Design a protein around this ligand. Structure first.
Ligand code: JP9
Ligand code: JP9
Ligand code: JP9
Ligand code: JP9
Ligand code: NA
Ligand code: NA
Ligand code: NA
Ligand code: NA
Ligand code: ZN
Ligand code: ZN
Ligand code: ZN
Ligand code: ZN
Lengths: 280, 280, 279, 279
């Protein structure tokens, strides 16, 4: 299997001014869409297993499903636990052979966030897998919110996370108003924190703002909603036109194909196309 | 894992006048729908991997996906290769640890069908997995067709198949005209062939004809199209009502739930509910 | 697989006045000897993978070898990492699916021992596997006693599930007969109130083992004496027939004599028949 | 894993005037000896799992043990079932993911041998693994030659990829020096035109091996001589120190001496460096 530490991927992206796309998976077709995109683009990629799919499918089953679809894949892949709020769940992903974990202590006090994140990072460092933490809440779309540079620095130094999620103008879900990222804040963090930044709420952010953020040290861009939209739209083109089309290979296949093209588009936006060669 | 030879399942069904449902799988949600149904019904079940899903997902990946979803399953499960027209493909399923295989030589001459089916059966017998063969073409829905008792007997004795697919009034797909099964022919085969019969084209056959066929020795009923219809209808209830519902857990979840209820209905039709206790 | 948390095994032993034998494995035959013994005795067992076998065979290979021999085994089995002096190595055992780990910080300062042992314990608790730590050096026989207060403090700060302490044993063939610190064990039974692990279990007189178990020893580590038994079995064959090249015969005999030693230890420990308690 | 069809290995050897060594495994140390040898020599190798080790350790466990030791191996490896006299057992090896099988019908009538061997070969061809059959009994040394016409007929009716024939070898330690039937091998090279398997390869003089390989022997089976080497290594340690209980030392030495024997056989066979041809 071509599985690689998320730290190896993110640091290479960070050092060369591109980003790794971190694409949320939900089932078989979504896994295949992402992997086929990465393989086509000769790009390293992260597949994110988050809280919702863990509640529906289970953590270990989703890991095993990825494994089952890796047989023909040659590009660097990293399975990443997204938005974990439990030390136990994060350790379960470690035990199941994930290449990256996010412990999201962002709803905890500063001190508790630090304590658990550091514990998770010490395990990740020991086993050469990536660790992500978050300082500052990032909510849903449905000035004060922005993470300070000093807070990011202190959190970063106390936890030793490999890559850091901060609050910089994004939110999860379909954007009601177009977001405007805190570019000055990203630049400060690049100079002072000096760690790869993770952009949460990557779906629906204008392309130009993504490209700029990446030049300022965003090295991981999380995308979920926009892929689910693409998948759903592909399914709809089929079932709306032919409600009695019962061949799942056709209806879900189209969802898969449309999602694949979205993932290709994101890989290219992020600058990660061709970068598989850097890891061979 | 609670995996059991398809021969053990089918013979028990045959000996006690019920049938094992053989439910075609296509992806993660369809697997889960079938397994959750079987577990709820305390029923033995077959999961069929056929030609279409092998072309989309691959043979080994689908096997591995089933494995990944078996963690919480206690009822007897048998993974079955459906409609294989290649000795190689059938041997690949054997190598991948299937519990049952169908080599479908029905488009070959009688002698070639016999030759390859026998070869497949000798391997199946050696490894204690189920083997299914077919004599007589069963086409699509879109007197002469009916398999003779003598042909079924000769094929059966030359091949040593464990369970036998024959042409008895069904066809694959959505029925244009309601089918009428060849009940007299089934009764002859029960008395003379004396092997469990497999009913292909089980989707959309009237319940009463299914129940009667089972009393005449049909012990495996294959169902695919009707489950795909149920899955598709569940997805449609969601996406038609809310085209912008992008939570796959909701849209595909509903497909999964509606398919699960169809599978429950089929298990009960077939008489296999509660029969897990017979194998504990 | 019939794999069980080391904590489940040890707590049950501790509550019921018996001990789990923790038998060191080295290769295929030694694994099978221990498993065949446990199955015969219907006993829960720990198989210990320690530093020596990790250097020779590798951590993950030895884990996978145990897995390969578990096909016909029904009794509770716990794979346990022995004498780990590295957080990394201990995390590797966790990642490879061990059911128990010992982080042995006994060569570190009290504070460092506590710090790393606690980190290890938090991971073990999260994943429902056993954690063992050690306070007090336990050396070799070729070459003292842990205080009750130190054992208590270490135990409460680390949250280990079972605790190795220095109570008069040593690793290796004993030159002189050991005498266990029974008074100290008894204090610990009342004050520390955790299952105790006895290191250096090889060659300890049976009656001292039985008494130690009543005072709260719930895990007894045995390695040298099994390797002696294995080596003696091989010798009976090769000394008698130097040209006996059938390994099934020479190493088979090592395996059989080792199996009987393991049976003897299981029965000494009181763990025979106890598989029933965990079904 | 660097696992390769036995047919790919043997055909390449046959085409290039060398042979693949087929080394019998018995346990962890013997597996590692063979693999470490192959890796050192950058040689393709077969590891043979035969009847004895199946009775002691089990077919699937030995397969899984090899898997566990392949983590650091880069050279072509083929796991091969040796001396199977059962269609069921041969199918079990196929199901467990072996890269080559021998169905040995040599104690059956010609017709039965053909029937079962052909059935086995059809499965092997379907799954791209090697198939070996045998025509002519090959016995033991403690206790003849296959005709060219019989070898041809058997070969054409079974479609085996490589063929074991009776050409003057026997299993075990040779009492008297063997003399291979070189004239008969040479006939077969021109007429049968299939890679030949040499059973009873232990103790065959080096020069006779080299000549046999030029006449189309492309697989040489070696077991007894490796078990001798392993046993001699163990003896050097236990005879000198009966109380040496460190298995890493006693069995380690067996492993080291066996490794050197395997290196010697690889080089004899001409397979050193040949890993390059398959990358
Ligand atoms: O931060 C993210 C990007 O968000 P958008 O795609 O909406 O822009 C992801 O990492 C999601 O937050 C994730 O879907 C929630 S769960 O853990 O998967 O349940
Ligand atoms: O015989 C069957 C029942 O048919 P219906 O469900 O239409 O009534 C199945 O066994 C199918 O024939 C199968 O879907 C084709 S493939 O091999 O899966 O591609
Ligand atoms: O403590 C033990 C008992 O010692 P005895 O058998 O001599 O009485 C074991 O747990 C050993 O200490 C172990 O062999 C060392 S290593 O880690 O396996 O290298
Ligand atoms: O043919 C062989 C070479 O014999 P020598 O090493 O004595 O020369 C091997 O293939 C053996 O025949 C094998 O040990 C028997 S078993 O099947 O492993 O029990
Ligand atoms: Na968003
Ligand atoms: Na139908
Ligand atoms: Na000792
Ligand atoms: Na010989
Ligand atoms: Zn997020
Ligand atoms: Zn059909
Ligand atoms: Zn010790
Ligand atoms: Zn032989």
């Amino acid at each position: 299997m071509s599985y690689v530490s998320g730290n190896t991927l993110i640091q290479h992206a960070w050092q060369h001014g591109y980003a790794i796309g971190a694409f949320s998976v939900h089932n078989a077709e979504t896994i295949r869409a992402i992997l086929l995109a990465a393989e086509q683009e000769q790009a390293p990629v992260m597949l994110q297993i988050g809280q919702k799919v863990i509640s529906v499918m289970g953590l270990k089953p989703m890991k095993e499903m990825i494994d089952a679809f890796m047989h023909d894949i040659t590009v660097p892949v990293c399975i990443h636990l997204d938005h974990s709020r439990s030390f136990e769940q994060t350790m379960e992903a470690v035990q199941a052979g994930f290449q990256s974990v996010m412990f999201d202590g962002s709803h905890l006090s500063f001190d508790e966030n630090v304590r658990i994140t550091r514990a998770v990072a010490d395990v990740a460092h020991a086993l050469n897998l990536g660790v992500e933490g978050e300082i500052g809440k990032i909510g849903g779309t449905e000035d004060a919110l922005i993470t300070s540079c000093a807070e990011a620095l202190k959190f970063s130094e106390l936890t030793t996370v490999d890559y850091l999620a901060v609050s910089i103008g994004t939110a999860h879900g379909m954007y009601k108003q177009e977001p405007k990222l805190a570019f000055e804040r990203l630049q400060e963090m690049r100079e002072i924190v000096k760690k790869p930044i993770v952009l949460h709420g990557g779906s629906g952010v204008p392309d130009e703002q993504i490209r700029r953020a990446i030049t300022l040290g965003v090295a991981k861009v999380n995308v979920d909603t926009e892929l689910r939209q693409a998948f759903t739209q592909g399914v709809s083109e089929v079932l709306a036109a032919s409600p009695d089309e019962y061949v799942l290979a056709v209806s879900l296949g189209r969802g898969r194909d449309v999602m694949q093209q979205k993932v290709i588009e994101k890989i290219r936006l992020f600058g990660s196309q061709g970068q598989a060669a850097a890891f061979a």
